[PDB]
Design a protein around this ligand. Structure first.
Ligand code: Q6F
Ligand code: Q6F
Ligand code: R16
Ligand code: R16
Ligand code: R16
Ligand code: D12
Ligand code: D12
Ligand code: D12
Ligand code: UND
Ligand code: UND
Ligand code: D10
Ligand code: D10
Ligand code: OCT
Ligand code: OCT
Ligand code: OCT
Ligand code: LNK
Ligand code: LNK
Ligand code: K
Ligand code: K
Ligand code: K
Ligand code: K
Ligand code: K
Lengths: 276, 282
């Protein structure tokens, strides 16, 4: 029977799917909870700012303000953006699929090229990010050859120290690729503590909202900064990739334990209810 | 456990790719400023034109405070404001279902980002939500790919039988891969782009563009399906969810297929250089 196996699979697909569906639902309700209020208070005070700009400047008639705002919304569809190096940045947002999109093509040619550039770049960059991960993996693999010797000749031994080693990756990894660069961005970009960490995560997961961008504002940047941030991305993507994947297997583990633990609760209500 | 003889062979391959990437970026960059710098200038001279016609048409406005005004508008437009008087009431951006949409942009890492948290809590949650969701959604997109793969696997069991005429094994692989790309383009690129053109009002190019940008999970968010207030059959948006769920699993294989094509090109070209050497000497 071969449809027997596919019904085993589609059972597993559907349950995950509903987990995702319900993870979204829980998510949605927490975001609306967090953002609906702050959306109201920003919408009442933006109508305050508006009528206060008719009274604090009686020169402005009510009719020609509507015209200005149309002109500004029009110019949010443009904003140099496409200078010799921000177009290099842009090519970066494509092939990493971070895609901040503060900058995005407007020419139909630029869109058509971007389509081609992506279908060829996103694979290509991939191979780099695998090598970047290969080397960086054997770097930390040597690192545990040094730490899995001095702690393994004494106090409590194997099968739990794997749980200690994985902590050292996440802890040192957070420092090198989350903490240290967030501190840098705090000073250089002017972001708060939270915003910098936020920007790290959003960008290294390649979510890349682009509500925050490293380099995006009109500051003096020391000519070493932006290229250090390239290297950070190049390396830090390969880090989160493993980080996300590690979380991946943890879910697999949790899903086994929980599934069989439900089975335990079942087998003890049965023989609790047989007992009359 | 991990010798230096093989890792030197690897770091040789990493570095060459890296410089290919570096150069692919450079070529890219130069084609994009080529395409976009001009149209950035002409929009940016005519925005200074529009400016002076209401710099000096109203000198009573402080005019330091006009450049401050636009700062106050664009800063507030990234939460999403409709600051007007002939439409002062305002549909919610974090309503029941747009926050559901947003949670979608996170765990798929499309991240359009027209909407993004402002609250410190929303940022903190979003960080947690992503580190747990991006793995989770992964599992779904693997099953979604599993089923969809065995669907097309049965499809070729029907087509790899009737085209057995007086046939190779490794050459019908080249016929199969064509029907994946052909039918896949129609189901997941062409047909939905046509839908979007009608429903969203986008041109032909914009729709296809939006498909690709979104299905690769680039997700600039210069275009979004559902983003405006228009009508929305609400048959529509849930169909688009399903399209994404399936279409991500499609591009994943599509991009991966391109992946091995590069592997193949990189083999032929590497050995062709070596031949080009002994044959340019002559
Ligand atoms: C509106 S602007 O585009 O013209 N200003 C800029 C903003 C950022 C950069 C830049 O290179 N930042 C570092 C970086 C590099 C590669 C990648 Cl993929 C992501 C990131 Cl954050 C340049 C200009
Ligand atoms: C002002 S608004 O931004 O809040 N307007 C909305 C915009 C879009 C949607 C929506 O569901 N679109 C389909 C969809 C679904 C899931 C994913 Cl991941 C991507 C996409 Cl395109 C809902 C509201
Ligand atoms: C013989 C020249 C043909 C190329 C024409 C370039 C002029 C600019 C027109 C751009 C039209 C958009 C298509 C670009 C696709 C690369
Ligand atoms: C190698 C066979 C050629 C197939 C080229 C199609 C690649 C897929 C890119 C998406 C283009 C969709 C076609 C839209 C035409 C209106
Ligand atoms: C019009 C399409 C142009 C794009 C062609 C891309 C070809 C990619 C060749 C890359 C060479 C890889 C060598 C790597 C050696 C490890
Ligand atoms: C062998 C060295 C490994 C890379 C160390 C990463 C340091 C972080 C630099 C990025 C700071 C923005
Ligand atoms: C009116 C139809 C617009 C078609 C635009 C061409 C799209 C090119 C993408 C295909 C590249 C392989
Ligand atoms: C789109 C840019 C293609 C760049 C061509 C790279 C060819 C490099 C040859 C290196 C010798 C192996
Ligand atoms: C044999 C696994 C398939 C179970 C039936 C569900 C198929 C629905 C396909 C999507 C319409
Ligand atoms: C060691 C697990 C603690 C993390 C929270 C677990 C959520 C409960 C799931 C049921 C096992
Ligand atoms: C968000 C998780 C809700 C509790 C887990 C429900 C899954 C049970 C599947 C057996
Ligand atoms: C049978 C697998 C796919 C069937 C429907 C796909 C069409 C999506 C239209 C948006
Ligand atoms: C569509 C233009 C491609 C430019 C690259 C030419 C060199 C192969
Ligand atoms: C609005 C439907 C037009 C039919 C598609 C033609 C463009 C290929
Ligand atoms: C945004 C309204 C559509 C909600 C769909 C929910 C599950 C498909
Ligand atoms: C099988 C359910 C997994 C949720 C953690
Ligand atoms: C129960 C309100 C949700 C509307 C989709
Ligand atoms: K992404
Ligand atoms: K993205
Ligand atoms: K990923
Ligand atoms: K994005
Ligand atoms: K974006």
């Amino acid at each position: 029977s071969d449809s027997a196996i596919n019904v085993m699979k589609w059972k597993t697909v559907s349950t995950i799917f509903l987990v995702v569906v319900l993870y979204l639902i829980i998510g949605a309700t927490v975001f609306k909870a967090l953002e609906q209020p702050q959306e109201i208070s920003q919408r009442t005070t933006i109508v305050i700012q508006r009528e206060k700009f008719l009274r604090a400047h009686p020169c402005v008639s009510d009719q020609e303000l509507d015209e200005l705002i149309q002109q500004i919304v029009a110019a949010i569809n443009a904003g140099s953006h496409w200078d010799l190096g921000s177009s290099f940045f842009f090519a970066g947002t494509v092939i990493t699929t971070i895609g901040f999109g503060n900058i995005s093509p407007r020419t139909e040619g630029g869109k058509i090229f971007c389509i081609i550039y992506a279908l060829l770049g996103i694979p290509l960059f991939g191979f780099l990010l695998a090598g970047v991960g290969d080397q960086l993996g054997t770097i930390f693999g040597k690192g545990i050859a040094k730490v899995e010797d001095t702690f393994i000749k004494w106090n409590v031994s194997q099968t739990k120290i794997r749980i200690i080693s994985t902590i050292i990756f996440i802890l040192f990894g957070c420092v090198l690729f989350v903490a240290l660069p967030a501190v840098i961005f705090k000073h250089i970009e002017g972001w708060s503590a939270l915003d910098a960490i936020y920007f790290v995560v959003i960008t290294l997961t390649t979510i890349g909202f682009g509500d925050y961008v490293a380099g995006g504002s009109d500051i003096e940047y020391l000519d070493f900064y932006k290229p250090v941030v390239w290297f950070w991305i190049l390396v830090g993507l390969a880090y989160f990739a493993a980080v996300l994947s590690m979380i991946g297997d943890w879910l697999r583990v949790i899903a086994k334990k929980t599934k069989e633990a439900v089975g335990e609760f079942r087998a003890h209500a049965a023989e609790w209810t047989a007992n009359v």
